[PDB]
From a paper:
A key development in this technology is the preparation of stable recombinant FcγRIIIa suitable for expression in E. coli, rendering a non-glycosylated receptor. FcγRIIIa was mutated for increasing stability in the absence of proper glycosylation, and to resist the harsh environment of the purification column such as low and high pH, and the constant shearing flow of solutions. Since the FcγRIIIa immobilized on the purification column has been mutated and expressed as a recombinant protein in the non-glycosylated form, it was deemed necessary to verify the molecular basis of the recognition for IgG-Fc. For that purpose, we determined the crystal structure of the complex at a resolution of 2.7 Å. From the visual comparison and the RMSD values obtained after superposition of the two crystal structures, no significant differences were observed. The RMSD of main chain atoms in chain A of Fc, chain B of Fc, and FcγRIIIa were 0.78 Å, 0.59 Å, and 1.1 Å, respectively. Consistent with previously reported crystals structures, no direct contact of the terminal galactose of the N-glycan of IgG-Fc and Mut FcγRIIIa was observed. The crystal structure did not show direct contacts of the galactose units of the saccharide with the receptor that could explain their effect on the affinity for FcγRIIIa. Crystallographic analysis revealed the detailed molecular interaction between Fc and non-glycosylated FcγRIIIa, although the structural data could not explain the molecular mechanism of how N-terminal galactose modulate the affinity to FcγRIIIa.
ADCC is a cytotoxic effect elicited by immune cells, such as natural killer (NK) cells and macrophages. Fcγ receptor IIIa (FcγRIIIa) governs this response by engaging immune complexes (IC) to these immune cells. Upon binding of IC to FcγRIIIa, the immune cells are activated, leading to the release of cytotoxic molecules such as perforin and granzyme. Herein we have addressed the mechanism by which the terminal units of galactose of the N-glycan of IgG-Fc modulate its affinity for FcγRIIIa.
Author numbering:
A (entry chain B): 232 to 444
B (entry chain A): 234 to 444
C (entry chain C): 4 to 174
Amino acid sequence: PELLGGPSVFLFPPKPKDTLMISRTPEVTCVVVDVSHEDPEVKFNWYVDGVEVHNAKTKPREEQYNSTYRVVSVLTVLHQDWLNGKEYKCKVSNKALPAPIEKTISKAKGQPREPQVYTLPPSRDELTKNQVSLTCLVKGFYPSDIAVEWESNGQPENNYKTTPPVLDSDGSFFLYSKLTVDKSRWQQGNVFSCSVMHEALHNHYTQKSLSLS
Amino acid sequence: LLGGPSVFLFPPKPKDTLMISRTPEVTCVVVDVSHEDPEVKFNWYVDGVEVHNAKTKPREEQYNSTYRVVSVLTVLHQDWLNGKEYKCKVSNKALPAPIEKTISKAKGQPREPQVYTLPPSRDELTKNQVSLTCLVKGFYPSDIAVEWESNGQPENNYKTTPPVLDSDGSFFLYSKLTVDKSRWQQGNVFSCSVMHEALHNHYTQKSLSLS
Amino acid sequence: DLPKAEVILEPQWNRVLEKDSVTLKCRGAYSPEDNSTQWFHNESLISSQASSYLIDAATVDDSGEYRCQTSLSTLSDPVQLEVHIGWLLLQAPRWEFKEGDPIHLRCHSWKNTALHKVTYLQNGKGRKYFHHNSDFYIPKATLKDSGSYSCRGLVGSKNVSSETVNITITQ
Ligand SMILES: *[C@@H]1O[C@H](CO[C@@H]2O[C@@H](C)[C@@H](O)[C@@H](O)[C@@H]2O)[C@@H](O[C@@H]2O[C@H](CO)[C@@H](O[C@@H]3O[C@H](CO[C@H]4O[C@H](CO)[C@@H](O)[C@H](O)[C@@H]4O[C@@H]4O[C@H](CO)[C@@H](O[C@@H]5O[C@H](CO)[C@H](O)[C@H](O)[C@H]5O)[C@H](O)[C@H]4NC(C)=O)[C@@H](O)[C@H](O[C@H]4O[C@H](CO)[C@@H](O)[C@H](O)[C@@H]4O[C@@H]4O[C@H](CO)[C@@H](O)[C@H](O)[C@H]4NC(C)=O)[C@@H]3O)[C@H](O)[C@H]2NC(C)=O)[C@H](O)[C@H]1NC(C)=O
Ligand SMILES: *[C@@H]1O[C@H](CO[C@@H]2O[C@@H](C)[C@@H](O)[C@@H](O)[C@@H]2O)[C@@H](O[C@@H]2O[C@H](CO)[C@@H](O[C@@H]3O[C@H](CO[C@H]4O[C@H](CO)[C@@H](O)[C@H](O)[C@@H]4O[C@@H]4O[C@H](CO)[C@@H](O)[C@H](O)[C@H]4NC(C)=O)[C@@H](O)[C@H](O[C@H]4O[C@H](CO)[C@@H](O)[C@H](O)[C@@H]4O[C@@H]4O[C@H](CO)[C@@H](O)[C@H](O)[C@H]4NC(C)=O)[C@@H]3O)[C@H](O)[C@H]2NC(C)=O)[C@H](O)[C@H]1NC(C)=O
Ligand SMILES: [Cl-]
């Protein structure tokens, strides 16, 4: 493990969902890799919009297969602060470095935009099969932080994948979520729902339904 | 890992491999070549077997004062699709040993895509523009091309997701064509064109218009 | 009256990085009776009485004016030293040149850490490339050699650069 350039820092956003519901705790995450065994000590300083804060929580070191430590510090953010646009600075200091590394993360900048949520039934051509595809189109949203889930008759449906967001011609984003179910279930008349959570929705939530006729 | 030129090796475009009217190529790009050591020799290997038909351009200096040099090898459509391996060995006064890089189509049982066009949702017809969707699922490998067209002209204003790894090991994607609501109401006919190795003649289209 | 001593730098570079060794060497004539040399750093008297003064590992606090004086000299005119922080520093015997002068730039790295894929920029345009670190020479300076100058490369896998510096060319 040679490590000529010393540690490197990567800084992560909270999960889209944790920012959008008060029940949940959104966190920013500072990860230092390539810490040598020779100079293991790492010190964090954290700043919100330039002011130093003191409430972050550093984990103990972790030996890795490549024989370097990984060191992680976690700062809990306020829901309002993340959404109000505040700048989170992680500053990291190690003797292998000529100067600390500073990384900054914030929510994306720009006028927010309400997602439009359209659900779509299977193509007729799909009714041939034993499984059909229930589709949820979510478009015209900004920023790209969003959560999309599916459920039926109250319970969450397990067999679905949502594509990541895609940047559309007008600066907004869109995605698709495909829910796969049995042909019987869909014809049996069951009610399915596409749950969307996003900062621009009244009450951070909207829910569109889908079923046969 | 401790300083000298650097090699990048690029696969042919999926379309060039799938369509017999086109010519796929592999491209071997060498950058960070000194002015003081400037001569660059490439050796090319298909499934271990040296070949001699590569076309290799003379070196061009970049904004950053380094030299760049490209070698291009034409591929047989079937060699690519059958999973043959392509190896570019690069050599230079400045290199302790030659650098070799290898590419191949991705490995695995190919699966045919299912292609389904899906019309705009009921609610979207409020808006002055609507979304025609094209779902493509059950396909392997991920290499694919998806276009849209109406009345012979191609349609410009669409976006297609990355492939997404689906739960059965296949891939799926969606492509969203946007059109003025008036065009949809008038009864125009739009097509999702799809190219993929596991389709018959590497091609299929499903169409979509109002009822 | 009596000639003034001078401060000599070894190595010669007026700009250095933290951790760089630098030796300040006082030159004047001593008396038979008095073997000492007094050293000032800005307004402060340095306690060491040595012929030459060692900054073994430089810090930003070592920055400033240095003067010396020897038993049979006046006090030296001051000599300037700027300790910079960072990975890379563009060093040069000076920054103004006459047409025809030689220019010797050094892309000095913190702790001499091995640097590769090194480029010397002028006016935001890579001018000269080396696979391993090397000094860059323009033996005959000219009007066109005027501009802003930086260097960069890789320290293992990490990307680094020097602060930029202006070079002027006179008549
Ligand atoms: C000095 O200057 C030169 C010139 O730079 C260029 O000009 C200047 C002004 C700058 O603007 C600069 O930005 C320009 O690029 C510098 O040269 C560059 O050097 C860097 C490395 O430092 C190269 O970086 C790699 O790039 C790969 C992507 O390359 C393509 O995409 C970029 C931009 O997106 C383009 O600019 C390139 O041109 C490449 O574009 C492709 O070119 C192909 C060949 O033409 C095209 O395919 C062909 O197309 C034709 C017809 O069009 C047919 O279709 C042919 O059949 C077909 O072959 C293709 O269309 C085209 N695509 C485009 C434009 O989209 C990255 O892939 C690569 O990333 C990997 O490796 C990195 C290691 O450095 C690492 O960071 C990554 O993590 C990743 O590592 C890999 O990880 C994956 C995981 O998925 C693993 O699977 C891999 O195994 C693993 N390793 C490897 C080795 O793969 C690099 O980032 C850059 O490409 C190169 N540019 C050029 C133009 O050559 C030079 O660096 C400068 N140096 C200095 C010191 O100043
Ligand atoms: C020695 O070992 C350690 C440990 O490695 C681990 O274990 C070994 C044994 C191997 O198995 C490894 O495969 C394995 O990773 C190595 O540490 C790794 O070092 C690399 C770089 O050298 C880091 O790469 C960065 O990765 C981030 C994304 O990382 C997330 O996703 C990973 C998988 O995709 C996952 O492994 C990571 O843990 C991390 O996971 C996230 O964790 C957060 C916080 O916990 C969590 O809340 C998230 O949910 C979770 N997400 C997921 C999906 O799991 C990537 O973003 C970085 O890319 C940026 O930087 C590149 C250059 O550094 C650059 O090319 C890219 O363009 C990109 O640059 C960014 O681009 C965006 C827009 O694209 C721009 O806006 C940004 O500003 C810009 N940023 C910068 C800085 O330029 C980067 O690829 C690994 O994350 C890191 N892994 C771990 C686990 O710590 C170490 O490298 C090894 N050292 C040696 C010498 O070999
Ligand atoms: Cl070989």
